[PDB]
Amino acid sequence: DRMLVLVLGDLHIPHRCNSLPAKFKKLLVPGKIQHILCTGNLCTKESYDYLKTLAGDVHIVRGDFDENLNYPEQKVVTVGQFKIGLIHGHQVIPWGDMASLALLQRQFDVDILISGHTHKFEAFEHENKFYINPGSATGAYNALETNIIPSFVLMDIQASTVVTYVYQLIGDDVKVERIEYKKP
């Protein structure tokens, strides 16, 4: 038995982008995925409504451009044997700072910490804990990057192991990378 968890964010619809890539939408079939963890910056209810069609359980934290000011700034969600922390990440300066993310890991008391904002995918183990940034699922521009690849993450959780899949749109084709993490 497994849990599938979709991890995505920084869509920036409607200001920076118009929609998810068509090839991504074709992959996200309703009913398949159990949980959605969204780093924020949807930035409107239209994208929230779309996420609700995909899974029964949708968790979203507040980004710096979200129009829904009621989203929580951070969240901790338990899926199977894993506690997962979620924050958008504009609060961390310098952006993506490893020492700050590791402090948040300890303070949230989580096995996996998910953050966004940078629009650059990351998935790595650091001091026996796992860190994910799904990137921007629409490939939305930012101020500090010259190339943003549309990206999202799927976690496949099985007992004390998670297999993290990253999906990227490169050219017009979907390509993937796979990273395994086991709790210590």
Partner: peptide, 16 residues
Amino acid sequence: XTTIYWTPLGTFPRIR
């Protein structure tokens, strides 16, 4: 080269 991965959402070439 021709490396591909199975995933729960389908089978795809490797990014790198």
